[PDB]
Structures are given as C-alpha cells and as structure tokens.
Ligand SMILES: Nc1nc2c(ncn2[C@@H]2O[C@H](COP(=O)(O)OP(=O)(O)OP(=O)(O)O)[C@@H](O)[C@H]2O)c(=O)[nH]1
C-alpha cells in the first residue's frame with residue numbers, strides 16, 4: 056500500500072515531464088484551414104506550394120494546413136472545431152460568373168462563413184484564382200458580365216487602383232469581383248477580424264510569402280487591439 | 286399514388302396516440318413533495334490537457350475515467366488520487382468521441398478521419414482500425430469485448446466485429462447527421478438522435494427500426510435512457526429537454542425556462558432517475574426534477590462552454606468537461 | 617424510396633400502446649422505490665465519502 | 669492635513685489588495701504579463717502600508733520618537749520600495765514591445781520561469797542599492813548640520829553626499845526612462861504603420877486611440893516622478909537653493925503615484941468582471 060502510492064506517483068512525474076516538452080511544440084505552430092467552393096483549382100495551388108493534412112516551414116516558422124474532403128455536406132456541422140485556427144484560406148474561381156451561377160453560390164458560402172457564431176474572431180485570406188482565362192474570356196466578346204450581374208452596368212474603376220500593359224476592361228472586372236466580397240467583409244466586421252484578398256494565377260510562385268505576411272499582420276493586429284492601441 | 290398513403294398513415298399514428306393520452310405526467314405528480322434546494326461543491330480539478338475537451342467516459346469501477354482533447358492526447362485519470370495513468374498520442378488531432386470498455390481492457394477513439402481506433406491497455410498500441418464510414422464519427426459505445434456500435438455523419442449507424450474488422454449490420458433511416466447514441470442496460474436496444482429533430486429506436490439483434498419520436502424542432506445533440514430502461518431524455522440547441530416514453534410512444538414532459546436561450550450539449554440522469562443533469566452553452570450546468578420540470582440547482586465554475594457530462598455507475602460523483610481544458614468532479 | 621417509407625410506416629403503425637396514466641405511475645413507483653440509495657439526492661456523511 | 673493623508677493611505681491600500689486577490693482567486697487571470705502587475709501591486713501595497721503612515725506621523729508630530737535604528741530602517745525601505753516600483757514599468761513596456769514588434773517569437777521568448785528570474789533579478793537590484801549603502805553608512809553627508817542630525821536621536825532628516833544622490837537617482841529613474849521612451853515610440857510607429865494599411869485596403873467602405881493611451885501612460889509617470897528626481901540633483905549640485913518644504917512636497921507628489929497604477933494597468937474587461945464578481 057505504502058509502496059503502491061510512491062510507484063504510482065513515479066509514473067505521473069514522468070508523464071508530466073513529457074507534457075511540458077510537447078507544449079512548446081504546440082504553441083510554436085500555426086494551424087490553417089483550407090476551404091474551397093468546388094472546382095476553383097484548390098489542389099493545384101496546394102501541390103505547387105478523411106481529412107488531409109500537410110506541413111511546411113518558412114523563415115523558421117512552422118505552418119500546418121488542413122483540407123477537408125471526406126465531408127461533402129451542404130450544412131457544415133464540423134465547422135465548430137476550427138474556432139482557434141490562425142486564419143482560413145478561401146479559394147474561388149473568379150472566371151466562373153457565366154457558368155451555372157457558381158460565383159453567387161461562392162458569395163453565399165462566404166457570407167455564411169463570415170457571419171458564423173463560432174468563427175467570430177477569425178480572419179480570412181481570399182484567393183481569386185484563374186485570372187488568365189478570366190482575362191481571355193473578358194477580352195472575347197462572346198460573354199458579358201452585365202448579362203449575369205446587373206449591378207456591373209453602373210460600376211466604374213476605382214481611382215485608387217493599381218493596374219498591372221493591361222486592358223482597362225479586365226481591370227474593371229477584377230476590381231468589381233473583388234469588391235463584391237469586400238462589401239460583405241466590411242458590412243458586419245467590427246474590427247475583430249479582417250479579409251485579405253489576392254489575385255492568383257497558375258504560374259504564381261509566391262503564394263507562400265503572401266500567407267506568411269498575412270499571418271504576421273493578423274497576429275500583430277490582434278496584439279495591437281488587445282493592448283488598446285488599435 | 287405511393288405518397289398518398291403516407292399522409293393517411295401518418296395521421297393514423299397521430300390519432301392512435303392521441304386517445305392514449307388521458308393525463309399528463311405533471312398532473313399525476315402534483316402531490317409529490319418537492320426535492321428542494323440541491324447544492325454541490327467541486328471536489329477535484331484535473332489539469333494537463335493543452336486544448337479543449339470534447340469527450341469523456343467513466344469507468345465501470347467508478348474510479349478511472351478517460352478524456353479526449355483537440356491537441357491529440359487521450360489521458361486516463363485516477364479521480365481518487367488525481368494522478369495520470371496513461372497518455373496515448375493520437376495520429377489525427379481531430380477527435381470527437383471516446384469510449385471505455387466495460388471490462389477495462391480497451392479504449393476506443395474516433396473523429397474527423399472517419400476511422401475508429403481501438404487501443405489495448407494491458408499489454409499501449411493500436412489494436413484495430415475500423416473503416417467503412419463515409420463521414421466523421423460522432424459517438425461509439427462498447428457492446429462487449431468483441432463488438433462495438435458507432436454513429437457517423439453519413440446518416441448511418443453500424444455494428445462492428447473487432448476481431449475481423451467487418452460491419453455485421455448497418456442501420457439506415459435517418460436523414461441528417463447522427464449526433465449521439467446510448468445503449469440500454471440489457472444491451473438489446475439503443476436509440477440515436479440526429480440533425481433532423483428525430484429520434485429512433487433500433488434493434489441490435491434484428492437490425493430494424495422500431496419506433497420514431499419527432500417532438501423536437503432543431504438538431505438533437507444528446508440522448509440518455511432512464512435507469513429503468515422504458516424512457517429516455519434528449520436535448521437540442523433550442524434550449525429544451527424532453528422526456529419520451531417507449532410504451533406510450535409519445536413524450537411526457539418538457540424542461541425549459543424563459544431566461545435561457547442557449548443550446549444544450551449533454552444530458553445525464555442520476556442513480557434513482559429523479560434528477561436530470563444537462564449541460565448548456567451558458568458556461569454552466571443545470572439540475573432538473575424529472576417528475577416536476579423545475580430547477581433544483583446550478584453547477585457553475587467553468588470558464589467556457591461545457592461539452593461533456595457523466596455520472597458514475599454507483600452515483601457518488603458527477604464529472605464535467607469544458608473547452609477551457611479542465612475537468613471537474615462534483616459531489 | 618417511396619415504397620420503403622410506406623412499408624416502414626405500416627410496420628411501426630400496428631403496435632400496442634398503453635395509457636400515459638400507467639407509464640407515469642410506473643416511473644413514479646420506480647423513483648419512490650429506488651430513492652433510498654441515491655447519494656446525489658441526499659448528502660452522505662464524509663466518513664463514507666471517498667471524494668472528501 | 670490628517671484627513672487628506674488618511675484618505676491617501678486608504679486609497680493605496682484598498683486598490684492594490686483588490687488587484688492581488690483578483691489574480692490569485694481566478695485562474696483565467698494567471699498570465700505571464702500579469703506576474704509583472706502582481707509584483708508592481710505588491711511593491712505599491714508595501715509602500716502604502718509602511719512608508720506613508722510613518723512619514724505622516726513625522727510630519728504631523730514634527731518629531732521622531734522611534735529612535736535611531738528605526739529611522740534608518742524606514743529610509744532604507746523607502747528607497748527599496750521606490751526603486752522596485754519604477755523598474756517594473758520598464759519590464760512591462762519591454763514585454764509589450766516584444767509582443768507587438770516580434771509576434772512569431774514572442775511565445776517562445778517569454779516563459780513563466782524567465783518571468784520569475786526577471787522579477788527576482790529586479791528585486792535583488794532594487795535591494796542592493798537601498799539597504800546596502802544606507803545600513804553601511806556610505807551615504808552620510810559631512811557638515812555641521814548633517815553630523816548634528818546624525819548625533820541627535822529625535823531628528824533624522826535626510827542628508828546625502830553627491831555620489832549617492834547621483835547614482836541612486838540615475839538607477840531609480842533615468843535608465844528606465846529612455847528605455848520606456850524608445851520602446852513606446854517604436855510601438856506607436858508600428859501602430860501607425862498598421863493603421864495606414866487598413867485605410868489603403870478597405871478605406872472607402874467606411875491614430876487617436878494609441879495616442880491617447882500612450883499619452884496617459886507616459887504623462888502620469890513623468891508628471892509624477894520628474895520634478896523630484898530633478899530637484900534631487902539640484903539641491904546637491906547647488907547649495908541653499910531648494911527648501912526642505914519643496915523637497916517634501918515633491919516627494920509626496922511622487923508617493924501619490926502608487927495609487928494610480930491599478931487604474932492605468934487594470935482596466936481590461938476581464939479585470940472589470942473579476943472586480944464585479946468580488
Ligand atoms: N489558367 C489556370 N488554370 C487552372 C488554374 N488552376 C486550375 N486550372 C485548371 O484546372 C485543371 C485541373 O483542375 P483543378 O481546377 O485544379 O481542380 P481541383 O484543383 O481538383 O479543384 P477541386 O476539384 O475543387 O478540388 C487544370 O488542367 C487547369 O487547366 C489556374 O490557376 N489557372
């Protein structure tokens with residue numbers, strides 16, 4: 056009896072030593088959730104850069120990304136688990152406005168995710184994929200955006216914009232598509248979380264530096280808001 | 286044609302059970318003296334988990350219990366002396382349920398990887414992996430030392446054979462995701478509550494549905510039999526708990542208040558069945574009188590929402606887990 | 617799946633039901649009989665309490 | 669003057685004990701950042717409990733009736749409490765600077781053991797400049813008034829050489845001041861840089877807060893502790909220029925600062941709900 060308590064306490068101390076060692080690793084890594092609206096080249100931008108998991112490291116910082124493919128449900132109940140991630144990566148094909156439409160469904164999904172009761176302090180990194188063929192089909196006159204989005208008729212290119220030798224038409228279309236998401240982002244945001252939109256193509260090779268910078272900005276803004284400085 | 290008879294059949298059942306209801310449960314139990322004020326105090330506090338706690342299960346000996354956390358550990362505690370016994374690292378960090386075998390020789394696990402893993406505690410290493418579900422697991426309970434029943438998010442439940450790793454039978458009939466299940470004391474029947482606000486009664490031996498109960502209006506999160514075995518209670522995210530009767534095929538009493546609007550995460554009964562313990566999203570827990578539908582106590586002290594709840598077989602203590610990576614024992 | 621729903625509905629429609637007045641009495645009797653050994657219902661002395 | 673002096677003692681004692689008991693009782697307020705706040709609260713509570721009542725009694729009675737050893741003990745604990753309280757604000761500023769400027773490595777750099785080591789190092793350095801040079805009589809002045817004061821038992825006014833009045837002043841005030849100024853200027857620059865980005869990105873769809881916060885934080889401390897640590901050097905460099913009344917008044921103005929720290933550093937919503945619970 057007397058020796059049993061001492062022996063049982065010996066195992067507890069050994070276990071507690073390992074728990075402290077594993078806590079340093081847990082707090083030094085950042086968890087990311089990858090959401091796709093369907094198609095949109097989600098796997099292409101992942102390969103170049105049940106549940107599927109991957110790990111990558113940049114500038115001696117550990118990142119660990121999550122992709123869900125085994126739960127194809129219109130209503131997402133498992134979304135409550137990812138309430139402590141650093142950021143959420145949203146991938147949408149900006150060139151699927153004419154195809155039956157997909158852009159409105161993606162916008163509705165973004166609205167549903169943004170206003171969730173549990174994801175109330177999580178920022179979203181937005182990737183607007185498939186820019187080259189978007190520009191090609193905008194240049195081609197066989198399709199028109201106004202035939203699907205009537206609000207595009209009364210839209211003008213912002214003065215505070217940075218075009219890439221680029222046709223003003225494709226620039227106007229790109230900024231209209233981006234502002235469609237930005238309006239929903241700013242409608243309900245109260246400073247607890249923002250959105251970082253990017254224009255992404257197939258030949259891009261710096262998609263990891265963008266994630267690094269966005270995560271750094273997210274953490275810095277969180278600390279600034281916590282210390283009553285923002 | 287075929288759908289025409291469905292409307293007639295559904296109305297026949299409703300009128301069949303409408304004549305049975307001659308008096309409410311509350312009407313008969315008006316003359317019972319109230320249980321009074323019930324106050325409980327925390328006896329133990331268990332620390333060591335690095336993330337939120339999603340599941341918990343007591344042992345048959347009423348001394349050891351197991352817990353699961355999102356950081357990827359499966360720790361077995363010693364409630365009497367507050368000493369960790371085991372710590373099993375998990376291959377997948379997303380875990381949603383855990384179970385403890387009646388004989389105390391095995392522990393089950395499962396989550397977002399659609400795989401159920403059985404661990405051997407007296408040898409710790411993985412003993413078997415069960416595959417075949419197309420959705421995330423929600424609950425799992427041990428029928429015996431060689432068979433186990435599980436529920437998942439693909440609207441189906443299955444009974445497995447641990448030795449061969451093959452599904453003996455599959456239960457179908459739900460429309461939404463199945464969220465919980467509970468076994469009968471004799472292990473011959475079990476119930477399940479899904480996201481279509483419906484609960485069904487299944488037969489393990491025959492693999493056929495017996496009855497259906499549809500008194501709720503939102504996704505059901507928890508379920509538990511009465512100790513007698515002829516009734517059960519459910520809890521949804523509309524701030525209501527309801528008691529259903531197997532023999533009468535209808536509900537008997539509802540437990541709700543106007544000052545609460547949050548969801549319900551877990552329910553549990555007591556040794557005699559007179560008390561009903563329910564966890565809420567309001568960071569605390571409530572104690573109800575089963576035969577009167579009035580509050581008798583409040584369990585407060587958790588810093589975040591309570592996700593797990595359990596009562597020992599001998600009924601000496603209550604264990605609650607929450608998202609602040611803490612476990613508490615109440616007596 | 618039209619036939620399956622009707623076949624299942626007919627299977628569970630023909631069952632024997634008892635009045636609520638008997639089920640409530642059965643639950644009341646069980647609770648009254650087993651309320652003696654309910655440690656959570658009535659506090660136990662600290663001599664026999666393993667958690668104190 | 670008894671009513672005003674009594675209220676000051678009550679305000680300092682009541683404020684600091686509430687903060688200390690809130691952190692210990694509640695497990696959600698136990699943070700590495702809160703350890704520095706606990707140390708500062710302990711220093712302020714000891715100051716308010718020990719230094720102020722005896723100084724008030726000395727001022728009102730106009731005589732010292734506790735002897736010659738207790739006066740040296742009182743002076744030593746005064747210097748110890750004053751030095752250890754200012755040096756914690758520097759640690760808090762450095763912690764915030766590390767948290768904001770380098771976010772990725774902040775979690776790894778700061779640990780509870782490191783915080784304990786820093787706190788004990790600060791307290792040791794504070795104690796090595798108050799008790800050691802005073803109990804060893806290395807700070808005593810050499811003239812007729814000072815020697816008569818030292819000989820007399822009921823008169824123990826403060827007299828000091830130039831070396832101690834320079835070194836103690838520097839260690840207590842001037843080294844922390846420039847560090848705080850530098851780190852807070854960098855924090856303000858980072859805040860402005862991050863505020864411009866939001867306007868550049870989503871500005872059309874819609875630095876007062878940071879300016880107000882930093883202004884309050886720096887202004888209260890500077891306005892409380894600068895005049896005394898200027899006249900401390902002045903009254904030694906130039907003789908027969910600073911009256912004793914001015915010295916005592918500025919010292920008490922500096923003492924008053926101990927009652928403002930709980931307001932400045934414990935306005936978080938968690939602290940508010942903790943105070944509501946108690
Ligand atoms: N021009 C261009 N084409 C792309 C891009 N991404 C994907 N594609 C096209 O998409 C084809 C492959 O299918 P994906 O779009 O990658 O489909 P996926 O990545 O599996 O996306 P999901 O099915 O939703 O998981 C390739 O042959 C490409 O032609 C892109 O960024 N730019």
Ligand SMILES: CN[C@@H]1CCc2c(ccc(O)c2O)[C@H]1O
Nearest residue numbers: 746747750751826836837840919
């Ligand atoms: C008698 N009051 C003393 C006098 C000098 C002095 C104080 C505080 C900190 C210092 O570093 C000092 O040199 C004052 O509290």
